[PDB]
Ligand binder design. Structure first.
Ligand SMILES: CS(=O)(=O)NC(=O)c1cccc(CSc2cccs2)c1
Length: 200
């Protein structure tokens, strides 16, 4: 069982800036969002199974999963939510575990945007939260996605509070400012995690 450090943070926390710094130190980074999207990408067996089970309306114009349609369809249908979890959870867990086993670094960085929201923190040895202000989240998302302020407000209202993230945090890193000093902060975390990984 390779030592797992979960990285989490809200929308617009600039998580890639922190993850890249660990990658630069030779840490294998395993991205939960990339894996989840991969499992249901066009041509993937789980996407075919979802379309067969729920219908062709689950497929968007570009061939990808219509995620809103699926959510609405399984919403308040517990049997179908249980079916969808029984399909996707083993597939995602198996790909995640495969990437962990293939990793060569002394510990891995598991990047999980919805770590708190989905109660997944118990799967990691250590939780690092990327801490940012709501203002920073709002600014970065609006510049990134070309979306309205009110649209980001709704996303923030639905995500975890900062106090909620810290409740499961072992480590916090402020990423409100410029990315310039992050590698220096991460260098210290990295040394600590090599120590923690060695005695785990
Ligand atoms: C929506 S998500 O993209 O935030 N992911 C998930 O819900 C999800 C579901 C099942 C499994 C895993 C990895 S469990 C693990 C396995 C080994 C080390 S850690 C994640």
């Amino acid at each position: 069982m390779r030592y797992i450090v979960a990285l989490t943070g809200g929308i617009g926390s600039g998580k890639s800036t922190v993850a890249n710094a660990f990658a630069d130190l030779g840490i294998n980074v395993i991205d939960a969002d990339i894996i989840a999207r991969q499992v249901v990408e066009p041509g993937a067996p789980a996407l075919h199974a979802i379309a067969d089970h729920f219908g062709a309306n689950m497929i968007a114009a570009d061939g990808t999963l219509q995620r809103r349609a699926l959510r609405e369809r399984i919403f308040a249908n517990p049997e179908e939510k249980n079916w969808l979890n029984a399909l996707l959870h083993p597939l995602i867990q198996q790909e995640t575990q495969h990437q962990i086993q293939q990793a060569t670094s002394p510990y891995v960085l598991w990047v999980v945007p919805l770590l708190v929201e989905n109660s997944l923190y118990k799967k990691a040895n250590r939780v690092l939260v990327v801490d940012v202000s709501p203002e920073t989240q709002l600014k970065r998302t609006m510049q990134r996605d070309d979306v309205t302020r009110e649209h980001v407000e709704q996303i923030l209202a639905a995500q975890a509070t900062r106090e909620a993230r810290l409740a499961v945090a072992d480590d916090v890193i402020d990423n409100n400012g410029a990315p310039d000093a992050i590698a220096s902060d991460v260098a210290r975390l990295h040394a600590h995690y090599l120590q923690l990984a060695s005695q785990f």
